[PDB]
Ligand binder design. Structure first.
Ligand SMILES: Nc1ncnc2c1ncn2[C@@H]1O[C@H](COP(=O)(O)OP(=O)(O)OP(=O)(O)O)[C@@H](O)[C@H]1O
Ligand SMILES: Nc1ncnc2c1ncn2[C@@H]1O[C@H](COP(=O)(O)OP(=O)(O)OP(=O)(O)O)[C@@H](O)[C@H]1O
Lengths: 71, 713, 98, 196
């Protein structure tokens, strides 16, 4: 049943892997936000903003095609 | 028979017939008694049985506005002086539907139920309402089993029961009231995972208070209203107990919800905070019905709270899954710190710099034992928020953004103190200069110090198992730094004298697992308390060489894992804890240091002794063992001076400003008479005052000392 | 509903019998309509007798409920799970009654 | 003096007759001024002692401006120029219930109270203000403790006897009535801090 859940869980909603991608998406996307909000030479748009926008571009691809299996 | 709130319904129509002075009890009195105010707030009014079930009452509200007022004038006494059996047959007549909801006695709709027979305006436009079933229908169709006896507003609220204590944040979610959550996701998914089991959908959440256990429920519901709630689960919504005073013993009320939510058709969930109630005497409550296997329910706790009733029971276990909630990572903090970051600064009408935000999460993570960076960070934050926002508020502003530092620092200063350490250098340069720092205390044992300074770095970088103590057993005499060292240690390390914690084996020959805090049988919390008070801490044991089979065997755990179990069952981190051991064993060999003995030689010579006194396993968690050896005047007189250094600490410092003179001979005299081979001038230290302070205090008494007036021997 | 029941029991049928089952005449053997049945149904069951089963309360009875419950009918109702393998195990448990 | 809260309406009632620039202040006027909108923020609608006492104002919300638009129009200066002692008595006439219901100043009920004669629909079909019937009835419902002192807040049970169980020191503060504690702001430092 727990397995039956875990599957259903994945099967219940978006397959963990999907939401795992949803997750990691949600991770930095909010982080990158607050960073440039203030005047900074260090934590500003310079470092992580460039880091994230590539890092977000890393796994962004599979989502909807791997969601298109549900389609 | 009637509800007391029907009586209260009756009260109003009467109070109406009282205030509005109706000479009799008529059919239409009870609508005003029904209607709370133009609100549907009465189960009779709009969301009511009436409007939706068959025909709108607001019409028959709108019109009876006059019916109320078309009552004739009375004089003071006679108004409604009669029970009016014409109306008052309902005294008996209302018994119709009272039980037929599977109940006890008559209710608002239910007295009204017989009123469609009795109280009605049955006319060309018949004003009589939901007709044959429709009331009883809507009596059931709204809540139903709507009342039992006398208790709770008769057909209360728009529906019935529950909603008083029924609390749904899916609303607050769909109302946006709810904080987004992080990082409990698959944890929720695991809770979510709990939910499919025909055997047990019922979780229990083990872990620290303040960790977010309730805030957990947000994402639970949040993902539920996200419809990340899966198929089976989607139908449910948020509900959880807000513990109500029973207001003799009214748990029937709390029994009320049960079948109510049970009848409610899985439209919601049940979550339960912490005490899942174990009454000292109410015992099984809902438990069998809880045991039925319907009724989704969520548990949450930390260890011992869990350990409370279920250890008796096991049926909770039999009826639940327990799920630990890990104290989230500092960055989990850091992340969701930012969550209400905008909030609280706007709550507090200010701004934030994540600099502090992480910084507290950096710093405070260590420094509030009790509360949790899972919150306390934020708690620091609101704290961080206010006073500076107060330094904004009434006047003390331009500072809006939280400073990094003071928001930590000053607040840390508010929290504890000595910012300068907590201010900048973190984890590191302390290390490099630690020894040379610690080189203050007593020279010699430097290697050990180094080894200490080593081992503390072994204690760091996590190379050595981050779950593991820093294991320290020390050799020497009184005066020698088993005597002393810990003083510097945390003062260096934790910046405190008291992270150092005192333990004597002599006390403990046999049973102290009794007073270790055994399993309550009378509260032995000491050891536990010692950390339970003081998590980042230094552990001095005395007479360690005499450590008895009891005390040593938990030393093993202390040696182990960097964790400490309790007798009550709690296990408690030793990893961030430092352990300190008096050992005088080779006192022979220690005394032989008269020969300034080859240390290792005499160490080996010693080792067997300690090697004897201890099983290897002990010995083999020990991160070092060192003598505290012979002392040099170089050492001595400095060590002498060391106290001489700090004489001022209150005196020339926080009081006198006394300008200090010492003759070097005296400074030697100090060693000379004073230094004890075995115990040092540590005995003379106790003496010092005599030959020193009083000698001055004498002059103090005299006043030959005025401030800076100083004459010595 | 005033017997406070989902189903209509042998006290309830008679409850309506209180009219045509009667001699209501010059010498009236009626059947007491409300007063006596209720409080003596407050004696005999209550809401306690919700209904929905087989029927049992003749003479001195009308109880064996609440804590008293059975799953056999429920098994004939198929309310539960066909077991396996404890058969001969049960054979013992069975034969214990012998 | 009249209650500010009352006078807040009263001058707004003078303002009421001013907006349509009424020729005279006359009984049925403030029936609009008592009410911004049906909200209990306007108590004279529902929370009024009449809707609970006798006359509910729901549909009876209808007629108030109906008169004040059908007043003969005037120009600015004659608007609110007259108490029109028929209405001008309500200035004094409001002091009648302050005795029967035990009050001192002239409050929202009282300004209301005086009106109970002609401020109304007074006809064969009379949607009106009962004289003693709604207020002394529900002026206990409302409140129950009419006296508010020389200076006071809403005189309709502000929180249900909020001043009859907890003194306001911010009175005495604003009244300057207590020796200000000293060396105490560092304590306060906590407090305000404690608060937010
Ligand atoms: N993951 C989270 N997301 C949003 N808010 C959170 C989260 N974790 C904690 N909080 C906040 O923490 C505060 C209360 O913490 P919370 O009570 O949830 O910790 P706890 O371990 O649940 O203690 P409790 O026993 O009351 O549940 C709330 O303001 C809540 O918004
Ligand atoms: N390594 C040392 N570091 C600091 N002070 C030392 C050291 N060795 C000796 N002293 C002197 O001794 C004083 C404190 O002695 P201490 O209190 O440590 O003895 P103790 O705690 O009673 O333990 P024991 O009975 O084993 O000697 C210091 O203030 C200092 O003057």
């Amino acid at each position: 049943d727990i397995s039956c859940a875990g599957v259903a869980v994945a099967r219940d909603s978006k397959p963990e892997e999907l939401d795992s991608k949803e997750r990691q998406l949600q991770l930095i996307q909010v982080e990158i936000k607050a960073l440039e909000r203030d005047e900074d030479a260090d934590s500003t748009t310079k470092d992580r903003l460039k880091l994230a926008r590539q890092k977000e571009a890393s796994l962004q691809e599979e989502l909807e095609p791997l969601r298109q299996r549900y389609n | 028979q009637f509800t007391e709130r029907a009586l209260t319904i009756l009260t109003l129509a009467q109070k109406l017939a009282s205030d509005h002075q109706h000479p009799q009890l008529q059919p239409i009195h009870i609508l005003a008694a029904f209607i709370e105010t133009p609100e549907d707030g009465s189960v009779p009014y709009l969301q009511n049985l009436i409007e939706k079930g068959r025909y709108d009452y607001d019409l028959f509200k709108k019109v009876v506005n006059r019916n109320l007022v078309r009552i004739p004038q009375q004089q003071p006494a006679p108004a409604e002086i009669t029970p009016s059996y014409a109306l008052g047959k309902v005294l008996q007549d209302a018994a119709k539907i009272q039980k037929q909801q599977k109940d006890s006695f008559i209710a608002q709709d239910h007295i009204l139920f017989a009123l469609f027979n009795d109280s009605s305006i049955q006319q060309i436009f018949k004003e009589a309402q939901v007709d044959i079933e429709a009331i009883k229908q809507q009596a059931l169709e709204l809540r139903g089993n709507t009342r039992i006896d006398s208790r709770g507003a008769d057909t209360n609220t728009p529906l019935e029961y529950l909603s008083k204590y029924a609390i749904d944040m899916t609303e607050q979610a769909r109302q946006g009231k709810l904080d987004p959550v992080i990082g409990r996701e698959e944890e929720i998914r695991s809770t979510i995972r709990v939910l499919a089991r025909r055997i047990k959908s019922n979780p229990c959440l083990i872990g620290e208070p303040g960790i977010g256990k309730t805030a957990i429920i947000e994402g639970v519901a949040q993902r539920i209203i996200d419809d990340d709630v899966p198929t089976i689960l989607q139908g449910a919504k948020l509900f959880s107990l807000d513990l109500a005073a029973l207001t003799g013993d009214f748990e029937e009320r709390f029994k009320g919800v049960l079948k109510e939510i049970e009848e409610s058709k899985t439209l919601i969930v049940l979550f339960i905070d912490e005490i899942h109630m174990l009454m000292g005497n109410a015992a099984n409550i809902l438990k069998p019905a809880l045991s039925r296997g319907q009724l989704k329910v969520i548990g949450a706790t930390t260890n011992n709270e869990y350990r409370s009733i279920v250890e008796k029971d096991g049926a909770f276990e039999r009826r639940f899954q327990k799920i630990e909630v890990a104290e989230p990572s500092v960055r989990q903090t850091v992340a969701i710190l930012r969550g209400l970051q905008p909030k609280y600064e706007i709550h507090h009408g200010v701004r934030i710099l994540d600099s502090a935000l992480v910084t507290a999460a950096q710093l405070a993570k260590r420094y509030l034992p009790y509360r949790r960076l899972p919150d306390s960070a934020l708690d620091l934050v609101d704290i961080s928020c206010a006073g500076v926002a107060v330094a904004r508020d009434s006047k003390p502003s331009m500072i809006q953004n939280v400073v990094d530092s003071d928001t930590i620092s000053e607040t840390a200063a508010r929290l504890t103190g000595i910012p300068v350490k907590k201010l900048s250098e973190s984890e590191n340069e302390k290390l490099i200069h630690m020894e040379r720092d610690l080189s203050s205390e007593v020279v010699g044992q430097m290697d050990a110090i180094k080894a200490v300074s080593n081992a503390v770095r072994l204690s760091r970088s996590g190379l050595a198992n981050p779950r593991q103590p820093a294991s320290f057993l020390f050799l020497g005499l009184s005066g020698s730094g088993k005597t002393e060292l810990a003083k510097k240690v945390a003062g260096f390390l934790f910046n405190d004298e008291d992270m150092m914690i005192r333990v004597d084996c002599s006390e403990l020959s046999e049973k102290y697992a009794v007073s270790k805090l055994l399993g309550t049988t009378d509260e032995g919390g000491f050891l536990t308390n010692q950390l339970q008070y003081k998590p980042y801490s230094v552990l001095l044991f005395d007479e360690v060489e005499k450590a008895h089979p009891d005390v040593l065997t938990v030393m093993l755990q202390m040696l182990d894992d960097g964790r400490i179990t309790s007798g009550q069952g709690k296990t408690i981190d030793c990893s961030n804890c430092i352990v300190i051991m008096t050992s005088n064993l080779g006192a022979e060999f220690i005394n032989s240091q008269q020969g300034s003995k080859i240390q290792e030689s005499t160490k080996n010579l010693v080792m067997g002794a300690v090697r004897q006194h201890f099983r290897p396993e002990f010995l083999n968690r020990i991160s070092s063992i060192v003598i505290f050896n012979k002392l040099s005047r170089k050492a001595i007189h400095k060590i002498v001076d060391i106290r001489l250094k700090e004489i001022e600490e209150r005196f020339e410092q926080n009081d006198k400003h006394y300008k200090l003179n010492l003759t070097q001979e005296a400074k030697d005299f100090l060693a000379k008479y004073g230094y004890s081979d075995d115990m040092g001038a540590r005995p003379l230290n106790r003496l010092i005052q005599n030959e020193i302070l009083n000698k001055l205090a004498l002059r103090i008494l005299k006043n030959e000392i005025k401030d800076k007036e100083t004459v010595n021997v």
